[PDB]
Structure formats: structure tokens, C-alpha cells
């Protein structure tokens, strides 16, 4: 569904709970500190890559300016600065799209 | 809730069981509780309890002595009124017979013989899964024969068990909850402590029984 009713739906609640979405994701990378630049994208030519970010694996989700209670979870409620892609675990392309949406 | 009311009623009152009447510094000085070992046997943590020194010997401050003794007696009597289990320890063989006899007379229990390893810590494995370990420990002799702290103060401080030990100049009152400075070695002092404790716990018991009988009437 293009609208945001997928979030009010119960499957979101049971699939996530009260915690944010990024809290579940984890990155596979080299040893110690991970790289500073995330992957370019999770989908290519309608082909998904292993260990994709949550917004990309859940195709029912939609990056949209209007889904306020959705996208409020990345930027901290205590500090207006958005989290960075190495933090929230998402790829750079969807991160940029989300920056444009939030702006 | 009336049970909690009865449990809490004695708390607000100070000297509610009338324990101060038992002891007086006259009696302590007569029983020679004010004595202490030599300065060589002196202990740092015991310094502030020493009133002074005379003839390479030590003397205890009887005001502090009476204060700590009043506190100890009040605590023991409150716990006896709360039915809290009490256990005596005195590794000194000089008074084991007397201590066991007075323990029988009180109804509370004692252990003057050799203390076995992990008696209280592993007490569940030793005795059984469910055993009500004692709620109060007291010490007529804190140090053992070779003069280091008995394992009981340590394991009691571990398992959060309250302790009431009489501390001589050699003893370490750090772990003790209600340490009473005095003369561990003198028989007059031993007999005085035993009489005071038995009278106090018996008063607490009989007061509990008469109060609960009054409430059964009401």
C-alpha cells in the first residue's frame, strides 16, 4: 500500500514492537570498525542483495515525507540532528532519499 | 495489616522493652569489662574505643561501651519479639559449658565447637534445600584461638546477616554491625553478658506472648 496504513497495521507492531526499525538490523563487514561509507544501494535491476537494510527488505514500507510517525524514528527526539547511515544501518541511496523527504 | 501494625508498634518507641535498667557502668566496672590488652595487642580500629592507657595496658571508654550495649540489647530484644532466630558463638573453651546451658535456658541456640568450612554459605547443601538460617548472630569471642577473625563474621557480612560481637582490643569491629567493646577474657564479664542477654530475650519473648494473647482476646 502506497499510503502509511501499513504502519498502523498490526503486522508492523508484531514484526518490530515498540523499538525502532534500525535497532534490529546488523551489518556484516570486515573486522573491528566497519567502513565509513555504506553500500550504494540494496536493489539493482530489481535484484536484492544479501543482508539488505530494513526499509529495502520490507518492500511494503515507503519513504515518504507525509509518514511523520514513521520517519521520526531515525532523527533523535532528544537531538534534532539525524542519525548517519553507518549508524542506522541503511544504504546511502535510501538515506539521501530520506534526507530529501524529511526536509 | 494488624500484624504489620504490631510489628511496627515497638519501633517508634525508644527503650520500649526497658533494657537500660539491666546494665550500669557500676556493674561493668565491677565485672572488669573496662580492661584491655597491652598496646602491643592494640588494634587501630579499636583506638577510638580506648579511654586511655596505663601501665602498658588499655582501658575502654565506658560511655561508648554502655551506648553500644544498649543498642545491642535493644536490637536483640526487637528481633526476639519478631521471632528472629538467634545464634551465639564463642570459640573460647573456657565458657562453652556455660554458654550452651544458658542457650538451652533461653531457647536460643549456640555453637562453641569447631566451625566447619562453609557451614552457613553452603548450608542448603549441608542440611537441606529449605532451612531457615539464623537471622541474628552474636559473638562472645570474635577472634579464634590463634587470634584471627572467626569465619562467622565474614560469612555473615557476606550473606547480609546481622552481628553483635563483643570486641576486645585485638578484635576488628569493622564487619561487626553492633560491636560492644569490652573484656572477652574475664569470666565476670562473660557471666554478665550471658545474664543480660538471657533476661533481655526472655523479656522480649514474654512481651510478645502477652501482647498476642491480648489481641486474641480482642
Amino acid at each position: 500500500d502506497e499510503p502509511w496504513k501499513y504502519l498502523e497495521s498490526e503486522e508492523y507492531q508484531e514484526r518490530y514492537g515498540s523499538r525502532p526499525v534500525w535497532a534490529d538490523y546488523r551489518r556484516n563487514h570486515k573486522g573491528g570498525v566497519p567502513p565509513q561509507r555504506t553500500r550504494k544501494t540494496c536493489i539493482r535491476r530489481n535484484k536484492v542483495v544479501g543482508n539488505p537494510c530494513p526499509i529495502c527488505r520490507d518492500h511494503k514500507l515507503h519513504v515518504d515525507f507525509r509518514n511523520v510517525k514513521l520517519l521520526e524514528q531515525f532523527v533523535c527526539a532528544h537531538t534534532g540532528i539525524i542519525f548517519y547511515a553507518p549508524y542506522t544501518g541503511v544504504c546511502v541511496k535510501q538515506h539521501k532519499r530520506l534526507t530529501q523527504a524529511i526536509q | 495489616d494488624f500484624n504489620d501494625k504490631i510489628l511496627n508498634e515497638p519501633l517508634k518507641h525508644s527503650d520500649f522493652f526497658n533494657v537500660k535498667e539491666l546494665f550500669s557502668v557500676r556493674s561493668l566496672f565491677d565485672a572488669r569489662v573496662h580492661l584491655g590488652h597491652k598496646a602491643g595487642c592494640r588494634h587501630r580500629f579499636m583506638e577510638p574505643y580506648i579511654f586511655g592507657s596505663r601501665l602498658d595496658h588499655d582501658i575502654i571508654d565506658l560511655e561508648q561501651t554502655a551506648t553500644h550495649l544498649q543498642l545491642a540489647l535493644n536490637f536483640t530484644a526487637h528481633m526476639a519479639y519478631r521471632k528472629g532466630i538467634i545464634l551465639f558463638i564463642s570459640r573460647n573453651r573456657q565458657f562453652s559449658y556455660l554458654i550452651e546451658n544458658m542457650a538451652r535456658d533461653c531457647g536460643e541456640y549456640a555453637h562453641t565447637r569447631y566451625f566447619r568450612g562453609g557451614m552457613l554459605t553452603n548450608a542448603r547443601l549441608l542440611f537441606g534445600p529449605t532451612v531457615r538460617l539464623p537471622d541474628l548472630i552474636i559473638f562472645l569471642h570474635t577472634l579464634n584461638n590463634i587470634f584471627e577473625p572467626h569465619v562467622a563474621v565474614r560469612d555473615a557480612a557476606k550473606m547480609n546477616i546481622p552481628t553483635v560481637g563483643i570486641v576486645d582490643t585485638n578484635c576488628n569491629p569493622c564487619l561487626i554491625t553492633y560491636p560492644v567493646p569490652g573484656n572477652d577474657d574475664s569470666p565476670l564479664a562473660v557471666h554478665l553478658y550471658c545474664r543480660l542477654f538471657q533476661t533481655a530475650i526472655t523479656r522480649a519473648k514474654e512481651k510478645r506472648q502477652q501482647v498476642e494473647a491480648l489481641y486474641r482476646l480482642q
Binding site: 535497532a23 551489518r27 532528544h78 537531538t79 547511515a85 553507518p86 549508524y87 542506522t88 | -
Partner: protein, 343 residues
């Protein structure tokens, strides 16, 4: 022959060879292992090559209130049942051999970020569901003996916490890994340290200390700062319930000493109410988000002191040239500020 044949348990023993020099000495072998199987449980006793239908055991004795009689299973349904049994055995072997997915903690082949679940219930009855466990470190200790030579003993260190300011570490040693885990878990749930915290997510003030040549400097930080500390410290903070701070370890590195010093410090930290009752003044907090506004933290429970503290000018205070550099900005290091993962 039939007499030369023999039963299954000794056969499996001799075939698997768990004993002998292989297993002894710890030499083992190069990652070859035959898994035990049970064939008697699989097939029911009735069927064979020639499928006589048995009213006694293979078919129900009575049907339609009529005793049955011996009959023949034709080859078509015989092959059908044989293919069904082949498929069933294949499914059994598949279900047996599969992946094992223990959540990735600090790294693969490391027992760092893994939790063993709550401690075991007590004998008298003590539900420890509130506690979460974590394994900080495990190593293969070896001590030698006359006859058997090297004797290996797994040593493990664990931590436990509510997430509510109460937590505790412990150590366990045993010949078996699971046994050491259990021992240390029980030891930890018995040994608990409580520590206060300022606003449910921070320590009260900065703590610098040394312990067995292991220096630690942990620094309070405000909300939304994150946990930038040693990974063991991150696990311990997650157990305790504090969500953000900073910390730098200096000198040696040894997680058990580190933990013991950390708990010593977090226990020796002073609360604001206790500090007020000690000093005799009102605490005053000033924020950057909030303007020049004094936020009262705690007041002395006793009577307030009449005179204020004299201003301490050019105070005698020892500090760290590292913090001086970080404050002055002349420091340069690529490793300081990185875009690391969540906490």
C-alpha cells in the same frame, strides 16, 4: 553369519571411535565426525520386502467388526511405500543436518556478545527472569599433571544485569564449557553489585582510576550521546541500564581486571543527594539547551549551611594531557571520531 553378527550399541561404538588416542591428548582429528543414528526408531516392525499384511501388528485386527486375514501387498503399492520411506528417511536426515545460528555477537568464533538466558531457578524458588546474562571472555587454560600431562580447563567470565542499576560479574572454571557457563552464571546471580545513576542513563560524574596496571577513564555525557566505550563496557552498560557515556581504557588490557575496576568505580561514585547531605549546600545544574537557569538537583536533608563554599581559585587539580589536547583542538587522530554502528 547370523551368529557372527551382533547388536547395535557396540557396533556404533567401534564405528565412531570416540575413545582412543584420537580423543585423548586433545589431538582429535581433522574435522571428520560420524553422527550417531538410530534405525530401529525409524521403521515400524511390520513392513519388509515382501509385504504380508499382518492383522496382528501391521493392520488393525478388526475392520467392520470382522476379523482380517493375511494378504499380499502387490508390487505397485510396495514400491509406493518404499518410496515413501525413502522420502521420510531423506527428510529425517535433512532435519538432522542443518545450519546452527547463534546470534553474531562481537565476532564469529567468539563468545563475547552472546547471552545464555536468565539464570537457573533456585531450589527454594527464585525466578530470575529479570536478569540478562552475557559472556565477556572465555579461554582454554592448561595445567600439566604427571600421568595425563596437560589438563585443559575452560575458564569463563560472565556478567548479569537487570537494566535497572543492579548487576554483577563472576568467573567460572570447569572441564566442560557448558558446566563453566552454568557455574559462572549462578555465581554472578549470587554476587550482585548495585550502582546509582543520575537520570537513568548516565553516571553522576567522571571517574578515573587504575586497577592492576589497567587505567580507565569514564566520562559522563548527556542524552543522545551513545555508548563510546570498550565493547565489554558496552555490554555491561546494556545490562545495567545506562544508555550513553564515554570511556577510554589505558595501559594494560585484561577484561576481568577492567570489569572489577569498573564496578569498583561505579560503586564508589557519589550521589547528589548524599553529596548535599555531606556538604550542606544546594546543588545547581546548568544546561546548554536550557538558558542560564539553575536547575536544583538535590538539597541537604539536614539543615542548610549558612556560609557558601569559598571560590577555589587556581585550584590544585591533576588532569590528563590527552583531555587537554582534545579540548585545545591541536590533537590529530583518524581513529578518534568514526561513524561506528549503533552504540
Amino acid at each position: 553369519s547370523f551368529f557372527t553378527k551382533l547388536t547395535a550399541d557396540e557396533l556404533w561404538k567401534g564405528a565412531l571411535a570416540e575413545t582412543g588416542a584420537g580423543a585423548k591428548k586433545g589431538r582429535g582429528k581433522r574435522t571428520k565426525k560420524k553422527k550417531r543414528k538410530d534405525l530401529n526408531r525409524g521403521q515400524i516392525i511390520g513392513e519388509g520386502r515382501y509385504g504380508f499384511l499382518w492383522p496382528g501388528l501391521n493392520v488393525p485386527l478388526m475392520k467392520n467388526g470382522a476379523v482380517q486375514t493375511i494378504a499380499q501387498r502387490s508390487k505397485e503399492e510396495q514400491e509406493k511405500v518404499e518410496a515413501d520411506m525413502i522420502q521420510q528417511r531423506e527428510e529425517w536426515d535433512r532435519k538432522k543436518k542443518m545450519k546452527v545460528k547463534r546470534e553474531r555477537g562481537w565476532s564469529g568464533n567468539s563468545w563475547g556478545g552472546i547471552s545464555l538466558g536468565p539464570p537457573d531457578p533456585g531450589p527454594c524458588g527464585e525466578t530470575y527472569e529479570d536478569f540478562d546474562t552475557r559472556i565477556l571472555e572465555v579461554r582454554n587454560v592448561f595445567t600439566m599433571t604427571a600421568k595425563e600431562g596437560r589438563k585443559k580447563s575452560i575458564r569463563v567470565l560472565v556478567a548479569v544485569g537487570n537494566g535497572k542499576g543492579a548487576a554483577g560479574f563472576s568467573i567460572g572454571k570447569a572441564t566442560d564449557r557448558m558446566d563453566a557457563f552454568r557455574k559462572a552464571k549462578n555465581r554472578a546471580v549470587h554476587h550482585l553489585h548495585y550502582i546509582e545513576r543520575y537520570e537513568d542513563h548516565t553516571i553522576f560524574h567522571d571517574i578515573s582510576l587504575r586497577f592492576k596496571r589497567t587505567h580507565i577513564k569514564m566520562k559522563k555525557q548527556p542524552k543522545g550521546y551513545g555508548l563510546r566505550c570498550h565493547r565489554a563496557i558496552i555490554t555491561i552498560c546494556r545490562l545495567i541500564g545506562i544508555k550513553d557515556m564515554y570511556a577510554k581504557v589505558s595501559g594494560s588490557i585484561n577484561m576481568l581486571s577492567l570489569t572489577q575496576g569498573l564496578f569498583r568505580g561505579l560503586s564508589r561514585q557519589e550521589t547528589h543527594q548524599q553529596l548535599a547531605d555531606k556538604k550542606g549546600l544546594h546543588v545547581v545544574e546548568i544546561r546548554e539547551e536550557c538558558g542560564p537557569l539553575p536547575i536544583v538537583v538535590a538539597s541537604p536533608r539536614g539543615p542548610l549551611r549558612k556560609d557558601p563554599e569559598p571560590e577555589d581559585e587556581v585550584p590544585d587539580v591533576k588532569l590528563d594531557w590527552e583531555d587537554v589536547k582534545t579540548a585545545q583542538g591541536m590533537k590529530r587522530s583518524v581513529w578518534s571520531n568514526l561513524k561506528r554502528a549503533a552504540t
